[PDB]
């Protein structure tokens with residue numbers, strides 16, 4: 001879920017682009033401290049935010065995770081990524097959660113929307129908001 005100081009695009013960047021350590025246990029502390037729980041799994045794409053914005057310009061397709069949405073876009077090329085999986089869940093001390101890390105080279109599908117009018121920078125009228133699938 002999204003903390004209130006984020007737009008959807010800023011939250012996408014925080015969860016899926018800004019991997020603050022190459023180790024999942026460390027990188028996941030940021031997400032988990034913002035969500036107040038240990039997220040069970042999460043992908044970080046080793047690409048730039050601008051590259052994702054350009055994927056939002058690729059043809060629209062149906063989102064595989066929800067057949068009623070048509071705001072998804074295929075990456076066209078594969079990228080390197082790291083997928084983090086929770087190995088150790090620490091209910092009453094989220095900083096003690098630990099993760100496994102899996103490196104891969106995969107395509108991705110992102111949902112994009114119009115930016116948040118009040119809070120997102122006008123530089124990018126169209127922004128990624130959800131990571132629908134890795135393939």
Ligand SMILES: Nc1ncnc2c1ncn2[C@@H]1O[C@H](COP(=O)(O)OP(=O)(O)OP(=O)(O)OP(=O)(O)OP(=O)(O)OC[C@H]2O[C@@H](n3cnc4c(N)ncnc43)[C@H](O)[C@@H]2O)[C@@H](O)[C@H]1O
Pocket residue numbers: 001012015039040041042043063066069071072083111112113129130131132133134
């Ligand atoms: N087998 C597997 N292999 C690899 N990865 C796997 C996997 N199984 C699960 N995953 C991924 O693991 C993560 C954890 O899933 P899960 O463990 O199932 O839990 P979750 O954290 O409660 O769920 P969220 O959907 O809210 O996850 P998120 O914050 O990552 O969502 P996202 O940034 O994409 O989206 C942000 C928000 O966008 C919103 N949204 C969904 N669809 C659209 C859409 N078309 N357009 C705009 N917003 C949309 C929702 O509110 C969503 O919360 C989810 O990304 C999932 O996709």
